[PDB]
């Protein structure tokens, strides 16, 4: 998972 940090963005449409 090279973009795992993105899993922490809870403030998007998805």
């Amino acid at each position: 998972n090279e973009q795992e940090l993105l899993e922490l963005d809870k403030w998007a449409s998805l």
Partner: antibody
Amino acid sequence: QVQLVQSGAEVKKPGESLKISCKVSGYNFASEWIGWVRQMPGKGLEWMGIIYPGDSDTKYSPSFQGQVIISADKSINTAYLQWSSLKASDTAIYYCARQNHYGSGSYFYRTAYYYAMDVWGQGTTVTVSS
Amino acid sequence: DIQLTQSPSSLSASVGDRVTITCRASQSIGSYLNWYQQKPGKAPKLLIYAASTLQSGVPSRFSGSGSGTDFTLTISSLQPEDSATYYCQQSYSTPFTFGPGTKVDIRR
């Protein structure tokens, strides 16, 4: 003023279960990650894991996964850390800290924010002894 | 997980001295790095995030720099109240590991 108020220091025997809490005020508890950090006597900081109270999504360090559960009750602005069976090596100070997010990003896709622990509880001293 | 080292492990310097602590990561983490200060008897305090952004309430003499694998925390004019332990932390991917720490002592 954001404030994290942690539960009191405890002593518990080996094998016992324990749940400690951190009560939050001053911001929307459901809207930021919040986490737990261990500090063993005379040692450095160890990031244990975080939880997002909004949906209770959790991320653990693999060193702590399956050994502790982090949970949250957003109805009373409280985050918890639990053990099923304490070991003597669990003796430490446990801090609960808000893992705030920084930077600006689009609503229409996931953003790589800068996350940092900007407000910390006073710490809970946990002692495993008979 | 990502591994961080800090150098040195402890240092001493005089009041007014410029002092640098170095963090090094096992992979490039861009600017996704924080610095914290822990004074004895106290919870840690956030000093810097995004590698160089100073947090509100932190004195100007603290500065962070570096990008990718290597990072430095600089205290420009060491004051006695800076005697403490400093931790870097990567925020690139969970777990957000803390470095081992560097203790700063005042020489007087």
